[PDB]
Design a protein around this nucleic acid. Structure first.
Lengths: 66, 79, 114, 177
RNA sequence: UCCUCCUAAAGAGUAACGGAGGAGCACGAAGGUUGGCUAAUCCUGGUCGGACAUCAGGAGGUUAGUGCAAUGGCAUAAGCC
RNA sequence: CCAGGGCUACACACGUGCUACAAUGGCGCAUACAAAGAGAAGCGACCUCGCGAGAGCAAGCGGACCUCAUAAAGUGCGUCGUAGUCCGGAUUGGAGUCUGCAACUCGACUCCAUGAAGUCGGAAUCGCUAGUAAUCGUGGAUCAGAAUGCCACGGUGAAUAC
């Protein structure tokens, strides 16, 4: 790498909402506090709530109730 | 958004299609009850609804239960 | 202060500022702070981080910006591909609830181009 | 480089049981990640590309290379050798930290996230994806920026086929919806 | 008035109110040296991006480029940095 | 005579009105002052449930007594602090209540959510000289359900007419 043309590459300490701390090198600043990480993101469960959204006869039986 | 106690249907349409299910998927029912709500026990039939001058054939699926028969019959044409 | 949808406001009262998220208005915003123990007349920056996360999941108890836009879209698309009268008005950009299309309904139909 | 140590121990032996290789380095490996961001609208405002340089310098660990126009096409009013975009080719140990900060803390920060496509392959093993917003990387402060900077990320590997490349990429915890 | 091809009959040269095109400049770098690099055009994927910007891979081979009209030549590159 | 549809249809132009574009204003809490009317195949207290439209039960009154019915602008405090913003409410999605055999074409109202145009309007044009204009609320006729329209009632209440 060429000297003194790239920004500072200081290692920071990030952490999501669940408390999963990881050490990364980036250009953020002093530290980092995140709200979601890949080991806690609802992507293995957010695909479950996208396909199971259909149905009308089951809702129609919630009005007739017999 | 109406009729909280029991979905609406006519005697003449309820007694016709209840007689139609045991006779297979026979001839379309020529009916004028656009106000009748659709139940899960008419799915598959080609019942025809009078839009004002003809009876348009509509193929009822599973989802169309909250809607009435007069939803799918265009009464007023435009170009 | 980077809760569910995007929601980074500043220098605003909490119940008003929570209205920015797609899927929550005024009434539901008051239900979020009531279950989170947050003072309504206090700005977001004054609230600590230990109270930001306790309303992050409280907002997640209601359908929000991410999956509500597709939920609204599929409800419309179900009508559009159905052939019903509710779909045909969505097909042409016309009012669905039976309004005065003859002269009015400029907003639904669109700006007057000719 | 956590993922590079994860690659050299776990991923390489996992890929030996998928395509029954005889040599240890017949396996595919990543070669480079090119952070290209083709602004295009810099023909009028030259400082937009100057601000575009700071975006790729903050997302990555190095200053970008301002690309030049290869041809003179009348469809976009660009002449020969005109600065129109910027690219960042990350190689060595440094790209693994960006590869860590992409798939762990930046993929969850994608708005309306549903997953990545498994058909975005050139046919050789080089995956390519294009993000629409830069606020998936926590380096960007989201307020002093004026224009929403989207970009595209391609991952050039040493795989022979795109199916073989996806199998190597599947061991790095990708969504692949 | 000058330059390029044919006419022009395989050295040179060779006419017509013959068939075809240009020039009366430019550059202090577009010169010299050293070092390094080499295209066009298609296929696939990829934010805006779309036939066509930019990026990554593959085919392809100099059909690219040579400041300028054409001829000859050029990778040992005369082409590009 | 009957069932369904139309009278509500839509690239468009015009008339009459309601609501807005806000800070003499919005929102939240507390709170003061009316007149005129209507009621029985109705008005429907009080109480219970429901965020709510409303549901159950339900006395009193064909009436200066009972009900519709808590008048509102207005006052005090807190907040918003000039932004398309807590202004504005169209449009749309989901869920509902009442009416009526039946609310899809095409009823009203409510809850949640989405949140538009609009930042005071060109030429031109309209109404008004007083308790009028301007503004706020209420009632009635029509009516099974259904008005910003019509009729009527009161509250605050200008400026100017050389």
């Amino acid at each position: 790498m060429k000297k003194d043309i790239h920004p500072k590459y200081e290692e920071i300490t990030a952490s999501c909402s669940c408390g999963n701390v990881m050490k990364i090198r980036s250009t953020v600043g002093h530290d980092l506090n995140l709200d979601v990480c890949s080991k806690c993101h609802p992507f293995f469960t957010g695909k479950q709530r996208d396909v199971a959204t259909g149905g009308r006869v089951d809702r129609f039986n919630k009005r007739f109730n017999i | 958004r109406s009729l909280k106690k029991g979905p609406f249907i006519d005697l003449h349409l309820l007694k016709k299609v209840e007689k139609a299910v045991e006779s297979g998927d026979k001839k379309p029912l020529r009916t004028w009850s656009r106000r009748s709500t659709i139940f899960p026990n008419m799915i598959g039939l080609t019942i025809a609804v009078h839009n004002g001058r003809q009876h348009v054939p509509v193929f009822v699926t599973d989802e169309m239960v909250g809607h009435k028969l007069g939803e799918f019959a265009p009464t007023r044409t435009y170009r | 202060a980077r809760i569910a949808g995007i929601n980074i406001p500043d220098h605003k009262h909490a119940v008003i500022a929570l209205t920015s998220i797609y899927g929550v208005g005024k009434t539901r915003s008051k239900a979020i702070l009531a279950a989170a123990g947050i003072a309504e007349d206090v700005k977001i920056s004054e609230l600590s981080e230990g109270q930001i996360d306790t309303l992050r999941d409280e907002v997640a108890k209601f359908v929000v910006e991410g999956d509500l836009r597709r939920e609204i879209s599929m409800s419309i698309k179900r009508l559009m591909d159905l052939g019903c009268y509710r779909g045909l008005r969505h097909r042409r950009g016309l009012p669905v609830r039976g309004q005065r299309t003859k002269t009015n309904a400029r907003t639904r139909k669109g700006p007057r181009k000719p | 480089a956590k993922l590079h140590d994860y690659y050299k121990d776990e991923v390489v032996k996992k890929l030996m049981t998928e395509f029954n290789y005889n040599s240890v380095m017949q396996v595919p490996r990543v070669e480079k990640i090119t952070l290209n961001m083709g602004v295009g609208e810099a023909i009028a405002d030259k400082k937009l590309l100057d601000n575009a340089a700071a975006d790729l310098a903050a997302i990555s660990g190095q200053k970008p290379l301002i690309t030049k126009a290869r041809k003179s096409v009348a469809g976009f009013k660009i002449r020969q050798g005109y600065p129109i975009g910027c690219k960042v080719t990350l190689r060595g140990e440094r790209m693994w930290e960006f590869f860590e900060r992409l798939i762990t803390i930046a993929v969850p920060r994608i708005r309306d996230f549903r997953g990545l496509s498994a058909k975005s392959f050139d046919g050789r093993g080089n995956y390519s994806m294009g993000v629409r917003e830069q606020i998936i990387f926590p380096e960007i402060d989201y307020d002093k920026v004026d224009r929403v900077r989207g970009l595209d990320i391609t991952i050039t590997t040493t795989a022979k086929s795109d199916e073989e490349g996806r199998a190597l990429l599947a061991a790095f915890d990708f969504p692949f919806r």
